[PDB]
Subunit: 207 residues, 4 copies
């Protein structure tokens, strides 16, 4: 079990690692994780993941009450929706990472499972990835969709937006996010070449 010290510390470090390696650019992205007391540690509003301050990270209750730190990111609203309908979720990584965001802008995505597996690792660690329709940023329908999907899915693709990825810790959610982004990137790299997709039996083996 990690303390609030190390959790605040981990959040700053993970933010910097994501920013320096291109997963987050500019003002985009936010991180959250459950604290020991059941409250939420989150990156503050208008923040840059490469410039986080452990001391000023937001703390909010799952019901939306602001507890300490700078005012939370406005997207923490739909972070909470996930926590409130999945007790296994201890941390959420939300990014506009390039290829997962690209995938989110495509027409004709399978809304229940937008990544057709050709590598085993997303299946083992994440599972299927549903798609939330596009809505104006701040729309309550975003959080509503996530609350309904959270009991069955460990990650979510917000159409015309980007991924929302859960995990049993912040580092595990970050690893899940990096695995997802790498898989989305492989989609665009493979392009229209003939892909050796995983067979139906090969996908069932990985659960």
């Amino acid at each position: 079990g990690m303390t609030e010290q190390q959790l605040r510390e981990e959040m700053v470090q993970i933010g910097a690692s994501l920013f320096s390696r291109g997963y987050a650019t500019g003002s985009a992205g936010n991180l959250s994780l459950l604290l020991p007391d059941g409250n939420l540690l989150a990156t503050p509003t208008g923040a840059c993941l490469g410039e986080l301050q452990a001391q000023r990270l937001s703390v909010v209750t799952l019901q939306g009450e602001w507890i300490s730190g700078d005012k939370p990111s406005k997207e923490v609203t739909f972070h909470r929706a996930v926590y409130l309908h999945n007790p296994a979720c201890k941390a959420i990584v939300h990014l506009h990472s390039h290829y997962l965001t690209a995938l989110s802008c495509l027409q004709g995505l399978d809304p229940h499972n937008c990544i057709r597996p050709f590598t085993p690792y997303v299946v083992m660690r994440v599972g299927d990835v549903p798609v939330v329709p596009y809505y104006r940023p701040g729309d309550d329908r975003i959080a509503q969709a996530l609350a309904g999907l959270a009991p069955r899915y460990n990650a979510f693709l917000l159409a015309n937006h980007g991924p929302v990825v859960t995990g049993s810790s912040l580092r595990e959610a970050t690893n899940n996010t990096e695995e997802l982004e790498e898989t989305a990137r492989l989609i665009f790299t493979l392009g229209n070449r003939e892909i050796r997709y995983l067979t139906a039996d090969e996908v069932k083996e990985l659960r």
Copy 2:
């Protein structure tokens, strides 16, 4: 309000962040920001954004008079044109960032709005992006075009060249630039795949 200390400091740091992360390569790019006294702080001529010296950053008046530091970048000429016709502009980021430059070399661009929105963030923070025709570097027509566009547009695409992005601070202009470059990159990533563009009503919601 930031002091000249911190402003010179911010410019060096932002330059290094842009250079290390690939937004600027070699000798390309320049930064400017309005000082408290109404003069312009700018990156010097023949400079490399990853090797800026706070102490030697150029200071020039909006009318072109060189005040302190190394001689300004020659492209500060069209930086000033923007400031002189947009009092909301406090900082300008000019880069040859790859995908915005690529977009600038295409034929058939909409000269009033070259980015057809499929994500909300460029619409919210920047708006439409006009295109300036290509002219020999140093041509006064570049600054002339920018002066005429500056009252209505917060960013500009110089054809066969690259973006010129304004902001209410250097960090905000850098975030706008990073958002624009990411959006241009998404264009080339999405390619000829069918894109779920934002509807006309979805674009009007974001102003």
Copy 3:
């Protein structure tokens, strides 16, 4: 000859260099090298190549007995298969590097030589690259295939997975891996453009 100090040190440094430069993401990848006593130094299970600890790197015998450090990566199983059938192999780099992994998901790969050479360097330093069929992670058939290929090939492409690259040291295996990944990347960059492949005589000159 390097000591265990420097070998543990080299492994941590090489891991960090691969992680910071994008060759490894998240929890993916592992390194191994032969120690002076014939045992294997390897990166531990559930490890992140950018966060290795020299002091806790695993040590295992080539027959699978765990000797010191954290429990080895589960993929060290097929590392050992290579060592046990190639005495020239002193170090193995396994990554899910993007373009070699992409190449590994394609249909119709030549299973004996999946990289058709258009640059001399993979031929000089690595040679032909066979393809191992896809199998569920942990399948003994993976190690079996590698043991049979190891006497004739210095690198291997695990289908729907990624590269396994040998070398006379960890740095040489890393350089071989970087050369291979760059060559795989060139394949996807060149795309369907007409390539000046190396002639048959030009390939024979490089051995």
Copy 4:
């Protein structure tokens, strides 16, 4: 005028900057620059540009006599050919940078001018880029071709290999190389889209 101290220093720093930013991978690439005494400072054989040691950089005469430091890179042979037929050349950057190497593997390149300009900067700072046919590494025909081209061209594309870029200093040659690589990258980014190429009059303006 820079001293040997600063020149050795600049070479190490420039190497690290090129390696960390992806222009050089593994064992590929070499740098050279003319010393005040007319001898050549060069990166040593089997070296990694991110791990250079100022103290052990090679010094060789333009006629090939090894003077100090580790044994020079074998590719310094064709570095010297350029110096011996262009007194304006004070530094040479040779890389296998991805997109310039990709361009070098294409069929049907214009051997006198392989980059059709759609941005002004390669024309202003480099000029036309000839193509040297592919030859086995170490072939004297490589140096022969470069010696014949050096009086008229400031950079050269070795087919199936990579760029060789001159400059009036190491930093200027590095900036030329970065500008060239960015232009080659734009070629592959633009792909088969209709490009607004620079007109014939627009290219003549830039000399």
